[PDB]
RNA sequence: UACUAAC
RNA sequence: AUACUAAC
RNA sequence: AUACUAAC
RNA sequence: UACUAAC
């Protein structure tokens, strides 16, 4: 438990594109498959890593901290795997500003997905 | 000066959820007209898809109610290679629209910071 | 019947093997689009021959897709699945054309001379 | 007035064909000098593909032959908010190279023209 | 990237 | 338009 | 008929 | 991604 880093999004550059939701997917799912992509414990932490608003209560303790830039937080209990993490959040954010129209079959899968489990589904 | 034509085919059945007439006309029809100096055409968008519900026919030029065809942008001009140079800048206009992610279109992206000035909106 | 030119944007894109992706090994992924299509479709103009037909020896064009069919509804769908290739070709990544990729897979595994 | 770091890594797995040691750096190291005054940083290319083959070890800074981690932009800086700059600043050159299709990279377009004025053997033809 | 409308 | 960059 | 995702 | 060649 003793290695970890943080994986900046660059927002300042993309402050259209919806980050969060993207690593996340529906019900989290995305995100808990990039950690089992990596072996990392993977948290987006930061300035706007939290939508607005669920009760603070049941929330993760100090994940309402929003003066450090939007991160994801790494952990591994070993170097290499930190950067797997690193590695496949970079393709998630590889995935957002370098998809042509149409074209991003992750957020696509992401609201289908989304979709089938509201009942709300084409 | 005898004049000839060819149509551009914009793939509307592939990018449905795309703007291209808005793309190729841009604010206040100077996209287009840019692309008629780059090419020494004459340009019209055509087709289905090229006028709006519900316009008013009588504020359209001759042909523009023709919807035989698809969207497509009419090429004209008085020579095959003008013709081919109206079709090039036309391609790079829709292939630039399809090969964007979402905010790198510095065409789209200027065309919508220019209308904003023109009707005085500029924030930031 | 009906007939159309469906230019390909070399000079957008100067490095890109558009006639090889067209036609496929033994010219089976044109043949592919010529019945998704309906459509009679020929490779014409300067480039679409190797470095025909009547009148395939011809080219004093740009390079084409020459789609022909006895109806505009066919002509219509011969564009966009040239326009499809196109798009593929320009949007896919590289290494990421799934298309191309099946394509010297197959051609290897016909020449026979697949790799594991 | 004491300083610290960051790292910023490198894309290399995904785009194994890309430069990008030659990209930010430029002719000269001039792109990155470029980049440290920006961000009010000193920068440094470090890591696994860092340093070319034969290097003479003679010619490198201290750290320089640190190969534990794999390539990327180191920043330091002595406080958070200019090390933030310093990634921005970096990761600004990475989104151009990775978003740009043939010969649409301006800042590689620009820096091998700079790099060819510098040498004479120029041709703005 | 304020969603464009020419002939 | 691609001259392929090498700083500390 | 890209349904705009909220994990710990 | 073995780099395709049909009519």
Do not use: W
Not at 6 to 33: A, M, S
Not at 79 to 90: A, F, R, Y
């Amino acid at each position: 438990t003793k290695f970890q880093d943080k994986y900046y999004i660059p927002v300042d550059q993309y402050p259209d594109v919806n980050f969060v939701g993207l690593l996340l997917g529906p019900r989290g799912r995305t995100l808990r498959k990039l950690q089992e992509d990596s072996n990392c414990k993977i948290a987006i932490r930061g300035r706007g890593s939290v939508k607005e608003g669920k009760n603070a209560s049941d929330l993760p303790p100090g994940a309402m901290n929003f003066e450090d830039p939007l991160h994801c937080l790494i952990i591994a209990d070993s170097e290499d795997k930190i950067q797997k993490g690193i590695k496949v959040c970079q393709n998630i954010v590889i995935k957002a500003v370098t998809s042509p129209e149409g074209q991003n079959d992750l957020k696509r899968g992401q609201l289908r997905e989304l979709a089938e489990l509201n009942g709300t589904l084409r």
